[PDB]
Amino acid sequence: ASFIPCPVDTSQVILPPHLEKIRDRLAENIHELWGMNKIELGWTFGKIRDDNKRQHPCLVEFSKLPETEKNYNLQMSTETLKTLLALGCHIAHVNPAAEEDLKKVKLPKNYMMSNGYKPAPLDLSDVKLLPPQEILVDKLAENAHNVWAKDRIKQGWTYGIQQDLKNKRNPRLVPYALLDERTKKSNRDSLREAVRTFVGYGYNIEPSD
Numbered sequence: 001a002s003f004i005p006c007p008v009d010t011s012q013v014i015l016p017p018h019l020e021k022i023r024d025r026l027a028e029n030i031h032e033l034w035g036m037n038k039i040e041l042g043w044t045f046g047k048i049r050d051d052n053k054r055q056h057p058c059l060v061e062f063s064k065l066p067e068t069e070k071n072y073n074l075q076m077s078t079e080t081l082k083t084l085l086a087l088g089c090h091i092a093h094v095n096p097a098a099e100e101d102l103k104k105v106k107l108p109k110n111y112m113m114s115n116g117y118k119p120a121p122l123d124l125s126d127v128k129l130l131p132p133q134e135i136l137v138d139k140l141a142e143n144a145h146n147v148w149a150k151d152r153i154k155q156g157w158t159y160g161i162q163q164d165l166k167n168k169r170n171p172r173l174v175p176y177a178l179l180d181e182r183t184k185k186s187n188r189d190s191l192r193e194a195v196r197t198f199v200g201y202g203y204n205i206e207p208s209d
Contacts, residue, residue, distance in 0.1 A: 001159065003175055005146035010082040019081055019091060026197050027077035028062045032104075033193065035059050035119035036111065045113045060117050080194055083143060084136070088208035095202030102200055127196040132207050140191045141184070142176040149173055 015023070038056060046055025058069055065073075084091065104120040112118040129137070152170065160169025172179065198205055 003149070003159065003173065005149040005153070007143050007146040007150055008083055008086045010079065010086045013082045013085050015078055015082055015085075018093075022091075022093075022198060022201055022203055023074070023077045023081055025201055026080065026194055027073040029122050029197050030076065030190075030194070031062050031065070031073050032119045032121040033190075035117075036107065036121055039111055039113070039119065045115050045117070059113055060115060080140070080191075083140060084205065087136070087139060089136070090204070090206045090208065091198070092204045092206070093202060094204040098200065098202035122197065122200055124193065124196040124200050127199050129192065129195060129199070133195050133199075133205055134192075136205060136207070137188060137191045137195055140195075141187050144187060144191075145176045145179070 038059065041054075043054045043056050043059065045059040046053065046057060049055065049057055058065065062070070062073075081091070103123050105123045107118060107120070149172075153173065155168070157168040157170050157173060159173040160167070160171060163170050172183075176184070195205060
């Protein structure tokens with residue numbers, strides 16, 4: 001009950017047009033990682049959403065996505081960059097040549113789907129994030145929790161030892177430092193691949209010193 005989520009204020013941040021391409025790149029790789037994981041959980045493609053057969057219609061390439069899903073991944077990529085800028089980060093395209101080496105992951109035949117779409121995430125296995133970039137991920141992860149926690153609380157949700165819908169109780173409405181470590185390691189990673197994505201295109205993620 002002493003938990004007060006005050007997330008980073010991004011309401012005054014305008015995303016510069018020179019970051020439009022790299023935010024299109026991030027949004028695309030998030031979707032590719034979404035497909036790969038969904039396939040890793042036994043999902044396949046279906047013209048209609050069928051949970052019994054694990055049939056998902058959005059297992060397509062980023063272009064053929066409907067406008068709702070496409071804007072959804074674009075907004076998540078935009079808010080990630082706006083959050084970085086809000087924390088005082090400078091995003092400079094310091095090594096444009098990195099896009100030369102950049103190659104995607106070749107996944108085995110099972111990952112190929114009936115409609116002809118095989119997800120191909122970037123091969124960022126060679127990208128090694130630095131101390132300042134790992135601290136950026138931790139701050140990015142703690143804020144996504146605070147963004148979510150603030151929104152649920154304002155909708156009437158309070159912390160409970162158990163979750164029940166009618167009384168608006170949720171055990172995850174606690175400080176981030178007190179959450180499930182398996183949960184803490186889950187979005188850590190989704191965000192660590194986002195930071196590795198920016199380095200993969202030759203962008204510098206510096207903190208303001």
